[PDB]
Symmetry: C6
Subunit: 206 residues, 6 copies
Amino acid sequence: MNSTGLYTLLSGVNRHSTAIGRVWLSVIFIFRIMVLVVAAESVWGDEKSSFICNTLQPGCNSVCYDQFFPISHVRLWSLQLILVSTPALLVAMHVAHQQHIEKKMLRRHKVHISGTLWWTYVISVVFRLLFEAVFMYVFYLLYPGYAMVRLVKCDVYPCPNTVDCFVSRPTEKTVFTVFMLAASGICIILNVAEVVYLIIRACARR
Amino acid sequence: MNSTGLYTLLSGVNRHSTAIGRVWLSVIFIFRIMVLVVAAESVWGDEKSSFICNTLQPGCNSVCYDQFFPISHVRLWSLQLILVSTPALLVAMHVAHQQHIEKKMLRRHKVHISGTLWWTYVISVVFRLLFEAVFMYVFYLLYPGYAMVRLVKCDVYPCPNTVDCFVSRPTEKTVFTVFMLAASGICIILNVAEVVYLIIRACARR
Amino acid sequence: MNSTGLYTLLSGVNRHSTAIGRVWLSVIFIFRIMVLVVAAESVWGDEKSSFICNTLQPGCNSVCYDQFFPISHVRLWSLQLILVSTPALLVAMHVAHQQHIEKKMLRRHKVHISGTLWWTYVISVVFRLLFEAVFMYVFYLLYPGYAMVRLVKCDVYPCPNTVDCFVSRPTEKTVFTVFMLAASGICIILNVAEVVYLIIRACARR
Amino acid sequence: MNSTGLYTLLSGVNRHSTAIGRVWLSVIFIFRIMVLVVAAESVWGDEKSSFICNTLQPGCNSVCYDQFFPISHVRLWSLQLILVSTPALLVAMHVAHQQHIEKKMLRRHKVHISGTLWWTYVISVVFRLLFEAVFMYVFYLLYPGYAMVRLVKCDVYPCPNTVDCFVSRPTEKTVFTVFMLAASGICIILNVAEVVYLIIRACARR
Amino acid sequence: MNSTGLYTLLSGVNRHSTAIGRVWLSVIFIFRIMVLVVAAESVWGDEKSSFICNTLQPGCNSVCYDQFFPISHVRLWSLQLILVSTPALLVAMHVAHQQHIEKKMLRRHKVHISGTLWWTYVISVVFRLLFEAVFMYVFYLLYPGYAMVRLVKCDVYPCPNTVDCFVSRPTEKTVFTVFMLAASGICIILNVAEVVYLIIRACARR
Amino acid sequence: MNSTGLYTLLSGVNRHSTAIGRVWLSVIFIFRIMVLVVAAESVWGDEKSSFICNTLQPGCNSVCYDQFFPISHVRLWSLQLILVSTPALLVAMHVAHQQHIEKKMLRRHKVHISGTLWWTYVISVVFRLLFEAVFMYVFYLLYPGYAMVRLVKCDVYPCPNTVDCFVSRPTEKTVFTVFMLAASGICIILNVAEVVYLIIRACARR
């Protein structure tokens, strides 16, 4: 259960929770992690030798794959996963530091400590939402369509003439792309909802 | 025993149990997981280079394998495994949240809490059954026969003429397919039985 | 020791033991697991590229390997291992459920509970013996001789003429086959002995 | 959580902390570790066969890749990671030794012990900053530009004539290089800030 | 420390110890395990493609490697490791069963229990020594010389004419072979010494 | 932290410590382990296919690589690591045995026990230093220069004419070689210092 515990900690939302981050956001995060693991291992796999171009010239396949796929889908997904996880790690380290300060004191102010923890948690949720939105926009920029292309025409050096060539598995890649963007959209919606509900609860407290 | 504990948690059915989910459904789930692991590692394996087509044209093998196998059997099985596991993760996170709320209160209403937990568990079981049925229908749509084909004729671009070519290991794939669909059918039957018995127990309580 | 603990649980025989399942059957089970792991990793390994047939025709090697080896030895051994393990998982889940019912009651009947546990354990042992015997018969059907063949003649499509070709490592495969069937026979004998001794003990109790 | 615990120990900063090393430096360190793992596994990968040079001469590809890439980016990153981690391991071992001496005594001086621990921690932070700066300078020396080159001309023996050839994935390598150098710069800034704040706190104590 | 604990359990010698099995035999066993792991992973590695024979005939390399190397060195070493470990697993399971019987009784005879445990331990040590001696004799039979051959002449079917061909790394294989046989001889000597000292201690008790 | 705990146990120096083995030697040992892991995985890697020789004759590459590299650098480093670790395992097993004897007695002499433990620890440190020095001399014998060669001339059978060929990555191999020998020299110096300081402390006690 160490993997599940770590994944929960990546959306732990510490003490100040809205029953949205702990239940729904955590499960969506774990689901996205599992889908990304499956896709990266099996579907994309190597994604370099699986790209075949109808050429005898050495190096034309590499440059042709580079031109159309500057960064892989799985690479962006893993990078987004790491950057989304980082605010949660910041909050966990901050709460551990605060607990250590409390135990050092043991060996008004508590209200201020709780307020600071709440503020840092809210800021981290906002930053997570911003990272998700930015990566969604980056995916839109680099890969407009949700479907993976099947045929591409290449004329870049050192390819002598224009050559047509093929992506490995467009259908599975399209399915996993739809899954990943659906999970990202659900995460964005849940993050916005959690921010709004946190603000409402804070206003109700005052 | 961490793997067994996680697999049990993927069918933990929390406190409200009918002696069907904990004993039978859990073991069938673990058995399906083991069979899928063995099949994905060894039987399908790469399932890309193992596909050989009698062609010299580069890229014809890839498109021919794509046309007849849009999504692999193991890919669908893993996706179904994840989607079936997700309601159980939702229930586990919900019960953890409820326990944390209880401990926060510690640091009528309990009857309502138990009722909500029972309702969420029943809804999750129904959703799991729905996912299993949907994936069974998807397997029927994509792969009508239980047996794996041996020979396929291909004429798609860029293959110059029609070419006949072969799947890697039809017999082992057929055996593992039969195992997986049998496990899925048993899971569907057990889910329906658990739903019915839960409804009967609830009626008996009232 | 987690692996050893899991393997013991796969022959845990819970509370009602005859000093045959816990000591001897568990060790034979673990020994068979280790031998299967070594064979699957190293000896059979890929067992697909290691099959070389004296042909230039693409796809003849695959169909020739399929005709003579419909299902691999290691595949059958792993499948038998899983199916033999499943009754033990059923018994472990059942005893966990019974313990949870006992603790729920805590938060004549006990004699009935012990009797039901004994009966389920006996039935599981019988089912394990049946699975072992069935897999032994399946091995006899598919692979009559204990020794692995060295040369096979192939004429199936698309091989143009009859071609002779070779298995990778007949001697190591034969040695590991003898080891595996010896372990299976010992397991069958021990299962029969445990059933008989359980019946004798039950009669002595009455 | 063992991996997270180890990574935290690699920036544990023991008892004398400034709320910069525990919260921010630890998370930046873990983020750099994750980015390096992803890059080394997927982006660079083998980085030897992915280098293709337009030659038929055997051995020209190896020497050409050697001339332009004496040491890989991931190799330097891993070496820097190890050397940066080593002062933290020294401090952890020293504090464990001091605790063992304390427990041996159990089975003024304590003030001196705390002072020595503080001094060793400060020296270790300074050494970590020095290692980071040295590796940044080494990266500047070996790879001036942040962007990865795409085309290189090679004339070294045994290549018969000058040949142009290509790096595998310049864009992903450039992105991960920018990420790694940004993380290193943030680590350098945070180390300098922690040193300054430690000196200020020490002066305030006196 | 789980691996070290398991390896110690593979020579645990339970309660009746002679300060030879626990200290010396355990360490020699672990050393042999580490050497075997290193050799199997790196030195022998695949040991199939590393065998190159000066032939164009397909299948001649496989049969030639089979004729001179019926079973690999690492295969025999792993098999010997498993068979040597099995008596220790029997003793561990027996002592666990005896402890469970003791706790069931809790929920003269003890002297008899200790005597039976001592006898089973002595018999297991004798069986371990017998297995070691048998495997040493098997290595002598299959591979007379300690040094690995470098050149072999092959004329078996389907090789058209006699062909000379080469083992991958004779020097490293020879070094690791010397290490493994030295460890096995030390284990044999220590097992004989432990048997003799156990008999002497038993006689001294009487 | 299990890996760190095991590595510390490989230099645990048990109870009689000089604040050199626990703090400095342990960290240098772990650093050497990490550097060896990185080098073996990435830098040397396969180190067999990475060796390319300008020949068409099959088997000339293997014999040429064998002649100049009888045993790999990483192979010697791993063997040295194991042999250096073994005295520490002996001491750990001995102290565990002594603790078990103490607890069996529980269920003058203690001074003698402490003296024997001190003596065994000193002898183990001396043996570790001897192993390090012997492996340093072996590296000097087999590989005189610290730098890895780039070009080698080969004329051994079956190579028809003299052929020049190339090592994979001389610069990275040279860097990692310098790192490993520097770590080994530091270990030797620290072992000598620990022996001297232990003798001085023992003389001071008397």
